[PDB]
C-alpha cells in the first residue's frame, strides 16, 4: 500500500539484493517475495516501466548450473539451497509473461574487441612446442571471475585471471611500438580493468585481500617515472570515473579515493618532481579535474569528487606548496559543492562529505592562515572574479558578499 508510491525507488534495493544474494540466498529470496507482492497488488501499468529492470536483474545468479539392510527398525530413522531459489525464480518468471519475460533483451556489445590476436602462448613439450592463443579466453574469464557462484570455483577463475593478466602485462612490454600506448592491450585494457578494479575491494574471504594488494602493487609500480609514459594514465583515467563517480559499490568509491591518494603519494615518491611539473595529467590537472567533477552537476559526479577529496586530504594536508598555491580554488569549489548540494536533496551523504571538506578547509587554514592573512598572489579561481594578491580577508569578504544564498 505504501510502496504503491514511487515504485521506482524500490528497484535499487532489489538490484543490490541481486548483487549480494550470492553470499546469502534468502536475501534474493525475500526480494523475490517482494516481487511477488508487487505483481499481486500493483497494477501492471506502473510496474511496466521497469520490467526492463526486473528481467535484467532477474538474470542475476541465474547463469550458473546405521543404515543396513537388516531390519533394525532403523530406529535412527525412527528417532528422527540456492537451486530451489532459482527454481522459484523461473516459477515466478513463467508467472510473469512473455512480454514481461522478454524484457531480458544494437551495438551487440562484443565486436571482437582485439582485432590483433597477439595474446598467445607456446606450450612447450618433448616432441614439439605447440602454441596456444590466450586472448580468446580473456573475455570469457572476464565474465567468469566477474560472475560465478561456487566461491571455490569463482575464486579459482579469479586466480587464473590474476596469473594471466600478470603474464600478459609483461608480454605487452615485449615489443612496444609507436602509437597509443603501443596498443598491445592499452585500448584492450582501458576496457578490461574496471571489473578487476572492483574485485580489488569485493565482498569476499579472499579476492578482496589479494586483489586490493594486487592493484596496490600494480599502480604503485605504475606510478614510476620510468613506468610513467601514459601506461599510468590509462589505468588512472579508467579509475577516475568507474571507481569514483558511479551509482553503486560505495566501498569501491572510498577504496579508490584512498587508492588515488596513495597513488599520487607513491608518484611524488618515485616521480622526479619535474616529471610531474612536465606532466599534463598531474597534481594541477588533478585539481582541475576535481574542480570539474564537483562542478559536473549530478549526484554521482559531485559525491565522487567530494568523497575523493575527503580521502586524499590525509596526504593533501601534508601537501604544502600546492595547498598554499590552492586555497581560493579549493574554497570556491567546495562552495560550489555546497551550493549545488543544497540546491537538491540533502539526504545524499555528500553533505556530510562537504562537512568533512569544510573541516579540511578550516584545518589547512589554521595551519597557515598567517600565510593567508597576507595578500599573497597565489593563483586565482573562477570563484574569485577579482584578480589580486589573494588574502584570507579576500576570500572572507567574497564569502560575506555572497552570503544570503538561495540555498
Amino acid at each position: 500500500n505504501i510502496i504503491e508510491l514511487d515504485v521506482r525507488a524500490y528497484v535499487p534495493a532489489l538490484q543490490m539484493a541481486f548483487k549480494l544474494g550470492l553470499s546469502y540466498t534468502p536475501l534474493a529470496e525475500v526480494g523475490l517475495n517482494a516481487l511477488e507482492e508487487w505483481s499481486i497488488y500493483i497494477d501492471r501499468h506502473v510496474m511496466q516501466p521497469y520490467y526492463k529492470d526486473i528481467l535484467p536483474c532477474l538474470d542475476g545468479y541465474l547463469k550458473t548450473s546405521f543404515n543396513k539392510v537388516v531390519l533394525k527398525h532403523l530406529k535412527k530413522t525412527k528417532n528422527l539451497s540456492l537451486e530451489e531459489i532459482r527454481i522459484r525464480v523461473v516459477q515466478m518468471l513463467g508467472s510473469l509473461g512473455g512480454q514481461i519475460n522478454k524484457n531480458l533483451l544494437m551495438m551487440k556489445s562484443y565486436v571482437a574487441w582485439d582485432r590483433e590476436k597477439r595474446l598467445s602462448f607456446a606450450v612447450p613439450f618433448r616432441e614439439m612446442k605447440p602454441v596456444i592463443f590466450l586472448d580468446v579466453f580473456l573475455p570469457r574469464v572476464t565474465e567468469l571471475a566477474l560472475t560465478a557462484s561456487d566461491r571455490q570455483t569463482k575464486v579459482a577463475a579469479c586466480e587464473l585471471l590474476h596469473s594471466m593478466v600478470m603474464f600478459m602485462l609483461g608480454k605487452a612490454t615485449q615489443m612496444p611500438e609507436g602509437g597509443q600506448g603501443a596498443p598491445p592491450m592499452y585500448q584492450l585494457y582501458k576496457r578490461t580493468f574496471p571489473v578487476l578494479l572492483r574485485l580489488a575491494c569485493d565482498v569476499d574471504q579472499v579476492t578482496r585481500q589479494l586483489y586490493e594488494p594486487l592493484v596496490m602493487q600494480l599502480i604503485h609500480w605504475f606510478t614510476n617515472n620510468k613506468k610513467f609514459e601514459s601506461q599510468d594514465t590509462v589505468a588512472l583515467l579508467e579509475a577516475i570515473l568507474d571507481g569514483i563517480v558511479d551509482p553503486v559499490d560505495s566501498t569501491l568509491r572510498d577504496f579508490c579515493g584512498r587508492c588515488i591518494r596513495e597513488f599520487l603519494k607513491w608518484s611524488i615518491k618515485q616521480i622526479t618532481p619535474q616529471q610531474q611539473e612536465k606532466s599534463p595529467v598531474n597534481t594541477k590537472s588533478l585539481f582541475k579535474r576535481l574542480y570539474s567533477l564537483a562542478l559536473h552537476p549530478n549526484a554521482f559526479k559531485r559525491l565522487g569528487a567530494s568523497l575523493a577529496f575527503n580521502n586524499i586530504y590525509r596526504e593533501f594536508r601534508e601537501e604544502e606548496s600546492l595547498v598554499e598555491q590552492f586555497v581560493f580554488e579549493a574554497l570556491v569549489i567546495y562552495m560550489e559543492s555546497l551550493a549545488l548540494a543544497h540546491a537538491d536533496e540533502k539526504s545524499l551523504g555528500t553533505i556530510q562529505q562537504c562537512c568533512d571538506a569544510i573541516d579540511h578547509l578550516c584545518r589547512i587554514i589554521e595551519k597557515k592562515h598567517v600565510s593567508l592573512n597576507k595578500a599573497k598572489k597565489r593563483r586565482l579561481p573562477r570563484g574569485f572574479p577579482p584578480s589580486a594578491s589573494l588574502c584570507l580577508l579576500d576570500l572572507v569578504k567574497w564569502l560575506l558578499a555572497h552570503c544570503g544564498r538561495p540555498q
Binding site: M107, K108, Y110, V111, A112, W113, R115, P139, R289, S292, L295, H296, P297, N298, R382
Partner: protein
C-alpha cells in the same frame, strides 16, 4: 576558450540540434561544452571539412566537422526527414509490421555559406575501410595501374573524350567492362575484414545483415532523392559497428544525373563488395523483403514529404548550381506516387543530359541494358513492391555498370 576563457558566465554554450525534444522539456545541465580538445583538423574538400574537436562539459572530446559554403540547410532538411521516416520505417520484420526504426543522422548548418555537423571520428568510408585491409601494395598498384585503362577505358575508349567515348558504349561491351572492373579491384576481402573483426560469427551475422538491409534501404532512399554519392569513397561506414550516414546531398529531385558533367548512370550505387560480403547471399532474400516492407509502408508519405521539402522554399539552389521548384516537386511526386525506376532514371538522364553523348544509350540502359533489363520500361510509373524492387536491383542497379561508368563513380569498387 580563446576570447573569454571556458566559463558558463556568458552561457552554457552547447551543441546545436541536440535540444531536439518532441515537446519534452530539455535539460538545463544538458550535455554541453566545458573545455576544449580543439586542434587544427581541417579536411580538404570543396567544403573544407573542419572537424573541430569539442571537449564537452564532461571534458570529453566531441569532434564536430564544419563544412564550407553552399545551401547546407538542404542537408539539414535531408537529415531531419531521414530521422523522421527512417525512425518509423523498418527495424525488424515484426517491427516493420510496426514500421519503426532506421539508424540516421542530423546536421546543423548555420548559414547558406557554412554548415556545422558532428565529426563522428569512429567511422570510415568504405574505400578507406578496405584500403587498410588488403595487401596495401595491391591497393596502390591494382587500383592504380589496372584501374582506368583495362576496364574503365575499355568501356569508354580518354578523359574529356570520356563522354563521347561512352557515345560509342553499349550494353555487352560495358558488361565485359564491368567484368574487368571486378579485375580492376580485389574481391571477397570484405569477408576477410569482417571475420577479423568478428569474434562470434552469428552476432556478426545479424549485425552485417541489418547493415546490408539498411544500406539497401538507404540506396532506394537515394533513388527517391537523387543524392550525389557517385563513388563508394562518398559512402561512409562506422568501423566500430557499421553505422550509416548519408553523404553529399548535392543533388535532389532527380538531379543525381540531371546536370552532371560526368555520367552518373546510378539510381543507387551497387558496389560489388557490398554483394561479396558473403558469396551465398543472392540479395534476393532478406533485404528484398525489407524493401518490400518499406514500400508496403510507403503509403501516406506524400502527405508529409511533398508537404515538407516544398513547405518552406522547395529546396532552393540545389539544382541551379548542380530550374523550377514546381518542376522539382513534380519530379518528387512522380517518383513518390509509385514509379518505375527505369522510367525515372531515363527521364532524369535525358533531362539535362540529352545533349550529353550516348543520351539515347544512357536513357536506354536506364530503361535496361539487356532484355531482362529493358523490360523495366513496361511497368512504367508504378508497380508492386517485389516487382519494383527487383526491377530496381536488376534493370537499374546492374546496368549502371553495364551501360557506362564514370571513372570517379568508382565502378570497380
Amino acid at each position: 576558450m580563446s576570447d573569454f576563457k571556458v566559463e558558463f558566465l556568458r552561457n552554457e554554450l552547447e551543441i546545436p540540434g541536440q535540444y531536439d525534444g518532441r515537446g519534452k522539456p530539455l535539460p538545463e545541465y544538458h550535455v554541453r561544452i566545458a573545455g576544449f580538445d580543439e586542434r587544427v583538423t581541417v579536411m580538404a574538400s570543396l567544403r573544407r571539412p573542419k572537424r573541430i574537436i569539442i571537449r564537452g562539459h564532461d571534458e570529453r572530446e566531441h569532434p564536430f566537422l564544419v563544412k564550407g559554403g553552399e545551401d547546407l540547410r538542404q542537408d539539414q532538411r535531408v537529415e531531419q526527414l531521414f530521422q523522421v521516416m527512417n525512425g518509423i520505417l523498418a527495424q525488424d520484420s515484426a517491427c516493420s509490421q510496426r514500421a519503426l526504426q532506421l539508424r540516421t543522422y542530423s546536421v546543423v548548418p548555420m548559414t547558406s555559406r557554412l554548415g556545422l555537423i558532428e565529426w563522428l571520428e569512429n567511422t570510415v568510408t568504405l574505400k578507406d575501410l578496405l584500403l587498410n585491409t588488403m595487401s596495401q601494395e595491391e591497393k596502390a598498384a591494382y587500383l592504380s595501374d589496372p584501374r582506368a585503362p583495362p576496364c574503365e577505358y575499355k568501356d569508354w575508349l580518354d578523359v574529356g573524350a570520356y563522354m563521347l567515348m561512352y557515345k560509342g558504349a553499349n550494353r555487352t561491351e560495358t558488361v565485359t567492362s564491368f567484368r574487368k572492373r571486378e579485375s580492376k579491384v580485389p574481391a571477397d576481402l570484405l569477408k576477410r575484414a569482417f571475420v577479423r573483426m568478428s569474434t562470434s560469427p552469428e552476432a556478426f551475422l545479424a549485425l552485417r545483415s541489418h547493415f546490408a538491409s539498411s544500406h539497401a534501404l538507404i540506396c532506394i532512399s537515394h533513388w527517391i532523392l537523387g543524392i550525389g554519392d557517385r563513388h563508394l569513397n562518398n559512402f561512409m561506414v562506422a568501423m566500430e559497428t557499421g553505422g550509416v550516414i548519408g553523404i553529399d546531398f548535392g543533388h535532389a529531385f532527380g538531379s543525381a544525373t540531371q546536370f552532371l558533367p560526368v555520367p552518373e548512370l546510378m539510381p543507387f550505387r551497387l558496389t560489388r563488395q557490398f554483394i561479396n560480403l558473403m558469396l551465398p547471399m543472392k540479395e534476393t532474400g532478406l533485404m528484398y523483403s525489407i524493401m518490400v516492407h518499406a514500400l508496403r509502408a510507403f503509403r501516406s508519405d506524400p502527405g508529409l514529404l511533398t508537404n515538407t521539402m516544398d513547405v518552406f522554399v522547395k529546396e532552393p539552389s540545389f539544382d541551379w548550381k548542380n530550374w523550377y521548384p514546381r518542376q522539382k516537386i513534380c519530379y518528387a511526386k512522380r517518383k513518390l506516387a509509385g514509379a518505375n525506376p527505369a522510367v525515372i532514371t531515363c527521364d532524369e538522364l535525358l533531362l539535362g543530359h540529352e545533349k550529353a553523348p550516348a543520351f539515347r544509350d544512357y536513357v536506354a540502359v536506364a530503361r535496361g541494358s539487356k532484355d531482362h533489363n529493358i523490360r523495366a520500361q513496361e511497368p512504367e510509373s508504378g508497380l508492386s513492391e517485389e516487382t519494383q524492387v527487383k526491377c530496381l536491383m536488376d534493370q537499374a542497379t546492374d546496368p549502371n555498370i553495364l551501360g557506362r561508368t564514370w571513372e570517379g563513380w568508382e565502378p570497380w569498387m
